[PDB]
Design a protein around this ligand. Structure first.
Ligand SMILES: [Ca+2]
Ligand SMILES: [Ca+2]
Length: 184
């Protein structure tokens, strides 16, 4: 995940007046009558209770992990309108790998630090492997995997994954690519 693109990202393209307008249509109806005006509610936040009702999010076990990652707030514990727009927008698989990752990483990096330790990494490997499944559960396959990589071109030996350990961990597990296809 190169930060170079992110630049061309900060701007905006995968979002248009048609994408938001329509979204505001159904959403405007979802909120009480005293909310018919999404203009005022825009400044207001949207509790989780209302989200757990949205099917587009109920289907993704990352209900909370979705709003949190898409939540551009300091508390990162609420779903704001603006954030919502970027939600259903990048909720599809149209986002390019670079963009697809940014959202992905944050999904795994709960700490929101920038690197995943042994336990954190395990979560990433498992996620792709298949949540609640008998599929090759957690094993040494992780330690050995991260190991070789480090010997690939890592001198920091931080003992975790960062930027480099990303171009490999991903480009080192083609089979896991299928799972990393659509993960939100
Ligand atoms: Ca972490
Ligand atoms: Ca590293």
């Amino acid at each position: 995940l190169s930060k170079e693109l992110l630049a061309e990202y900060q701007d905006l393209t995968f979002l248009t007046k048609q994408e938001i307008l329509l979204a505001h249509r159904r959403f405007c109806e979802l909120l009480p009558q005293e909310q018919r005006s999404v203009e005022s509610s825009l400044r207001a936040q949207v509790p989780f209770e209302q989200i757990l009702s949205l099917p587009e999010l109920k289907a993704n076990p990352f209900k909370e992990r979705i709003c949190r990652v898409f939540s551009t707030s300091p508390a990162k514990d609420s779903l704001s309108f603006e954030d919502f727009l970027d939600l259903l927008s990048v909720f599809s698989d149209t986002a390019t790998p670079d963009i697809k990752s940014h959202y992905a990483f944050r999904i795994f990096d709960f700490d929101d630090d920038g690197t995943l330790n042994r336990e954190d990494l395990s979560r990433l490997v498992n996620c792709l492997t298949g949540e609640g499944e008998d599929t090759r559960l957690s094993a040494s396959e992780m330690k050995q995997l991260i190991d070789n990589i480090l010997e690939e071109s890592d001198i920091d030996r931080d003992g975790t994954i960062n930027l480099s350990e990303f171009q490999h961990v991903i480009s080192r597990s083609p089979d896991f690519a299928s799972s990393f296809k659509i993960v939100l």
